[PDB]
From a paper:
As we observed unbound ring-shaped Elp456 particles in one of our datasets, we also determined the cryo-EM structure of free full-length ScElp456 at 3.7 Å overall resolution. The newly obtained structures of full-length Elp456 are almost identical to the truncated crystal structure of the Elp456 subcomplex. The structure confirms that Elp456 contains two copies of Elp4, Elp5 and Elp6, forming a symmetric dimer of trimers. However, the N- and C-terminal extensions of Elp4 and Elp5 (including a small predicted domain at the C-terminus of Elp5 (85)) remain flexible also in the fully assembled complex.
Residue numbers in the entry:
A (entry chain D): 66 to 171, 233 to 419
B (entry chain E): 6 to 233
C (entry chain F): 3 to 273
D (entry chain B): 6 to 232
E (entry chain C): 1 to 273
F (entry chain A): 66 to 169, 233 to 416
Write the structure that this text describes.
């Protein structure tokens, strides 16, 4: 049975013709090739230098899910049935209150909205809409809670967001042991595969302190990976030399694609290095085709 | 903004960066930098209290107000002592405190994050020194084939707010390479620990990429200049 | 343009000759290693299709006559990274009957029902029993494919390569005719870093398996600049152990094929 | 003197060296050398019984006389079982024995000497091989700095009477450095593990320095030429 | 260039081998670091330091200007070592007519293992060693230098000992109850040919690094890196330590220099280039 | 405390006027510089190869002491005396039966030996004793101290043959603490009764890690290094001395640490200057 086809936030893919959902950023979906994340998969957005661009993506995911549930609650003059419930594995309780608000400034619609960083989403999400799971509890207990929460919401779209995976201030050294982290990721992958008709997964990690073995293990475990690299000194200085006349035409760094969705699962080599750029604007975060000046 | 101004501001501790790291080798120690720090703090007139932690120090410094011999005394009571000597949990009109630790090489890796979280507070800032040449012990107990936890240096470099690297400047006829070999085989040459040394400064910007610079510092004239 | 070619493994021009099954007490191993960007779905599918239908019709564009097969011939597939449905969906595009292949699930509920509150010996014995029960009922013609077993080393703590070989791999190989190992060689390909001694318990398994093998297949991307005309390059080379056959003249032929993947189609050609 | 005669004599088990060590890698295994050994021994009436110990292989060789699966039983049972298949301290001069170990990379280091202190006998010749790439297991010995025991390879080389090293002869258009860097990336080229290969032989004597000789062996025609 | 004339020994700015200012104050502990190889034992260094502290001035190597004592006749020295015995020090000192009441010797070699190490834990043995040392200092008041030679051997004696443990319970507690301390150690571990022991035996080198860091002056004796004739024995280098001098005179400083010494039968010289 | 004043085996050193004892080979006593090894000291001899040459040196060392003991004829109450008791720290008790016999200013201080001959009569338990190296260090130290205390004024000769052999020493003793403590205790004992006890030992370095090597080298008083030649050197020497079958040197001798000369602050290194040869009647060392 899965998710009811009356749901608004899910659209069949062009190629696979399978259920797909957007991430809240149109450029991110466009890069993925499916213009969305097909249900039953995952994605990893690793980061270089201490910079913290990924929190924007995590908040965009959570806000898109919350907004879908909110329009479902509204259901203006019809029965839209855009139900969505979001589960976040973290301990930053303020995260729920940091979701950006909608953008109200000056084909298939209602799929992906437009968000504003400066604004704030209101009212605050209710407890039934959003739950948090402590990342310090034992692996078995966490898996049990995730399974129960999945079971309780029988007919709701589920997004599992793991913000800032493997942060030293966020996890004890015991959790850094290979067995614990790898087993947790394996269990999460199993749970995603089981209810493949309703659940999607998103996560991010900073690779500055991660040993290469754990990095390759995580890359193998997930379904897709995107690498973000900020620019260097001479790059930024030379760009500002000839682009400071237009202060709205300077990016922040490059985007690298290593593992794609099912495209690469069947045996396609699609690794593109240094051919895309990302720019974080005052209200929006965009991705465009990189071009060397 | 001229980098000299930023260096003077951070040296005066007018900035609100909570954690500061200093890395040194045997070619150039660090206590001169602490002398510069306290001289700058007194010059500004903001005589913040200073707390010293004793690990590899026997002679009590002049400027320090509280002395803590943590060598013979365990970690939990050490944290209790630091907390007790620290100001209140919350006081809007409380004077800022200064915490100096001689060496960070005596704390096990599985405690650094907890210790840093517990000692941290908006009232006080901590400066610390880590010895690059000293290598910790990893054969005391061996967990599963690899524990995957990062080393000490990488951990502090990740969790710090400003990175200070101290290097020696050679005035003789010896190249850097031969100096390094002599130090490695422990045949100490002449012309080390001079009063004029080189500094590498790294500041973590609030939003995104950090900024790094190089400088030449003399401890007699207290005149910091920028090397191109 | 280039000329289409046909896959070949051994001197008798047969990819998976059937006499391996008629001979009694002669166990053999295959080692398929690949990188993370060259996923071997087509290789496994073509191998199963050759075993059951008697020819790799997917790749050789039906350029050869059919070889007798499909008489009760069976296959067993287990994996630690894809559970049950991925194999079923991949297979149900070549009309393979559902009564000839059996898929074991080692992805769903594995950690909860296997690892927590169980010692390592119990884990290995139970997995071996699960494999044995499946292999028992089809003893005549059954190749056993297993993909990424070394992942176990991560889930179990205190588990060593020698222990894994002693308690899991060798007993399984002793009760099988053709055992095929699918592995990922990401470990050896970390740029500007060495893991020779920094991570050795993982490479030990790969080296030991290659030693105990008789034929090796390598899936790699292009070392030179990118060429959209081809995906990677498949190398077929001699293994490390003699073939447990009776035809003394049967020898493996080493070669390479430039292979390009498309919308569910692989093109093979030298260059 | 002709080293070929010495090589033929040592291969034919004419000597009295009670331990033979082979060195291998993933480029060239060492079972071909074992086949050469048994062929030479059989071709000159030295049809000694052969005892095989299994750690890796599961297909029993035809020439093998006793097959024991050591992958399961522990040390004391294994050594007792091996001893029960040997003469007991009063070996008759009727015939010799030849115990073969498929791989030594699996016995804990500390027991090696004790193992060699038991199975050794005047009527035996332990022929064993060591994989140069398979690094030892650190779970056995405590990694503390107090432990100053030498590594497995050096201990075995010091305690062995004759050392045999196997190397692969290159034929294609590649070089040794290219082959090594390809192997480190696990991109196996073609032409490796062929039938013609180099050799290194070290013989040690109780009256002078050991000696080294390098041969080229063709496993098909049984030709041993001098490099 | 090529001065065969022997030169006197000078360490600090005031042209004195060992000033007395390190004694007429409280809380002014200091540490000398002497490093030698197995080729060049620093016997004459120890003898010269002891005679300078007790008699009043170096004589074996200097011009013998014949100055008076820096302090009272009570001026005392304490010598202990984990590598040598009592008679060694006694015979070495009696060659210079050193009074028997002006020095004391602690024996850390005779029956050490059979009566100290066996059937005892680490804390107990470290405490006993510290108590035995502290007894000598509590015997007599200040102007009592303490010399300990090769203390790092405990790392190879006690099972599972660490540099951090040794410094935090033996070296620093003893330095806190002393005025001037001297650490004499062998640095052959750094000169093993073509073998970077820093990555393997890092625990040993950690002790040397930490001791040098806490030092205020370093004296190193080394054989000539480039081989020459029998006209010289070795080279002595004087370098500033890694810690400031605990002194009130802000004008004081340590002079950095190098000398070459040649040693013949029970007598060594000291000259410039 | 003390020994016989007119002991036939003890003579004052030339360069130090100290009691001295010969090691069995006059060449070693010459290379030492003190006309023998002075009492209260020790010597360590290495060999960087798989062969064995130090064994005959230890055999000579024990044989000289047993011969000095052997001057006890039934015409006893001689003015001379050579009271000597030998302690060997090993397990191969057959070594005692392999001691070479006699070949045929101060007199009888040093004897010449022949390797081929044996020593009839064989030594008895009351003179040569054995201690098993497979016991806890405390037990070994207790046994050695008991033996030393029991003998009143007999000159004790202590020799350790084939130190650190894997087939001879269990891996447990390979821990740094155990072996280093054993050497430290033996040094303490030999420095306690410095007027009588002498210590000798030999080792092979091809299986010893450099750290343990430098520690053991530091623990001893004098180190001698033996290095045989390679194939090319052997062939060149054979070609040169084709007509001289007595001038083929097996290897070099390296001097790194000496007796008291070194400990008082002298330079005594000499690399590639002396060549040795295992002659049928003498371990002959000469200029290279």
């Amino acid at each position: 049975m899965g998710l009811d086809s009356s749901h608004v936030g899910v659209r069949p893919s062009p190629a696979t013709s399978q259920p797909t959902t957007s991430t809240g950023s149109a450029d991110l979906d466009s890069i993925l090739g499916h213009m969305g994340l097909p249900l039953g998969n995952s994605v990893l957005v690793e980061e270089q230098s201490t910079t913290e661009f990924h929190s924007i993506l995590g908040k965009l995911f959570a806000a898109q899910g919350i907004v879908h549930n909110r329009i479902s609650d509204s259901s203006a003059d019809k029965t839209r049935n855009g139900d969505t419930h979001v589960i976040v594995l973290s301990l930053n309780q303020m995260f729920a209150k940091e979701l950006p608000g909608i953008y109200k400034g000056s084909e298939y619609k209602d799929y992906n909205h437009q968000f504003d960083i400066t604004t704030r989403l209101m009212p605050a999400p209710i407890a039934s809409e959003l739950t948090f799971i402590a990342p310090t509890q034992p692996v078995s207990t966490i898996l049990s809670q995730i399974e129960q929460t999945i079971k309780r919401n029988d007919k709701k779209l589920i997004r599992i967001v793991i913000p800032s995976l493997l942060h030293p201030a966020m996890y004890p050294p015991k959790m850094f042991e290979s067995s614990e982290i790898i087993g947790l990721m394996h269990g999460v992958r199993s749970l995603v595969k089981k209810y493949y008709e309703r659940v999607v997964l998103f996560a991010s990690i900073s690779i500055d302190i991660i040993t290469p073995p754990l990095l390759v293990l995580l890359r193998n475990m997930f379904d897709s990976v995107i690498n973000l690299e900020p620019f260097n000194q001479e790059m930024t200085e030379f760009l500002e030399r000839v682009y400071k006349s237009q202060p709205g035409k300077i990016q922040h760094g490059l985007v690298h694609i290593l593992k794609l969705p099912v495209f690469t699962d069947r045996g396609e080599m699609r690794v593109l290095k240094s051919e895309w750029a990302f720019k974080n604007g005052r209200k929006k975060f965009e991705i465009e085709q990189w071009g060397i000046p | 903004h001229n980098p000299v101004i930023l260096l003077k501001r951070i040296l005066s501790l007018t900035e609100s960066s909570p954690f500061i790291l200093c890395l040194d080798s045997i070619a150039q120690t660090s206590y001169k930098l602490i002398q510069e720090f306290v001289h700058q703090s007194k010059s500004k007139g903001n005589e913040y209290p200073i707390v010293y932690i004793s690990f590899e120090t026997v002679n009590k410094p002049s400027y320090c107000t509280q002395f803590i011999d943590a060598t013979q005394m365990d970690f939990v009571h050490l944290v209790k002592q630091i907390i007790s000597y620290l100001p209140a949990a919350t006081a809007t009109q409380a004077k800022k405190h200064m915490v100096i630790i001689d060496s960070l090489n005596y704390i096990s890796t599985e405690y650094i994050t907890r210790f840093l979280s517990e000692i941290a507070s908006p009232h006080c800032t901590m400066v610390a020194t880590y010895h690059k040449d000293i290598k910790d012990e990893n054969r005391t107990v061996i967990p599963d084939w690899n524990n995957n936890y990062p080393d000490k240096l990488t951990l502090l470099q990740f969790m710090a707010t400003t990175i200070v690297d101290i290097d020696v400047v050679l005035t003789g006829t010896l190249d850097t390479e031969e100096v390094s070999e002599l130090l490695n085989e422990f045949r100490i040459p002449r012309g080390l620990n001079n009063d004029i040394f080189q500094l590498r400064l790294v500041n973590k910007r609030k939003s995104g990429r950090s900024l790094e610079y190089d400088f030449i510092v003399n401890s007699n004239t207290h005149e910091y200049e920028l090397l191109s | 343009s280039v000329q289409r070619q046909d896959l070949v493994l051994f001197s008798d021009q047969s990819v998976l000759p059937a006499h391996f099954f008629q001979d009694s007490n002669s166990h053999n191993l295959f080692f398929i290693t690949h990188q993370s960007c060259t996923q071997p779905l087509w290789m496994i599918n073509a191998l199963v299709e050759t075993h059951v239908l008697g020819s790799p019709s997917s790749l050789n564009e039906s350029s050869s006559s059919m070889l007798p097969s499909s008489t009760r011939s069976h296959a067993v597939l287990a994996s630690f990274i894809h559970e049950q449905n991925y194999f079923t969906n991949s297979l149900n595009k070549l009309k393979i009957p559902s009564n000839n292949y059996n898929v074991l699930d080692f992805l769903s509920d594995f950690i909860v029902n296997n690892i927590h509150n169980k010692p390592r010996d119990k884990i290995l014995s139970d997995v071996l029993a699960k494999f044995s029960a499946a292999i028992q009922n089809n003893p005549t013609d059954t190749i056993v494919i297993i993909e990424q077993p070394e992942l176990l080393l991560s889930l179990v703590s205190g588990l060593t390569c020698s222990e894994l070989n002693n308690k899991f791999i060798t007993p399984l190989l002793r009760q099988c005719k053709v055992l095929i190992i699918v592995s990922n060689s990401d470990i050896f390909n970390i740029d500007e870093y060495d893991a020779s001694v920094h991570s050795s318990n993982l490479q030990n398994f790969y080296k030991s398996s290659f030693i105990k093998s008789m034929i090796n297949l390598n899936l790699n991307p292009l070392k030179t600049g990118f060429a959209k005309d081809v995906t990677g390059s498949l190398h077929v080379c001699r293994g490390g152990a003699p073939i447990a056959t009776s035809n003394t003249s049967l020898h493996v032929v080493e070669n390479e094929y430039l292979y390009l993947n498309e919308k569910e189609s692989t093109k093979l050609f030298y260059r």
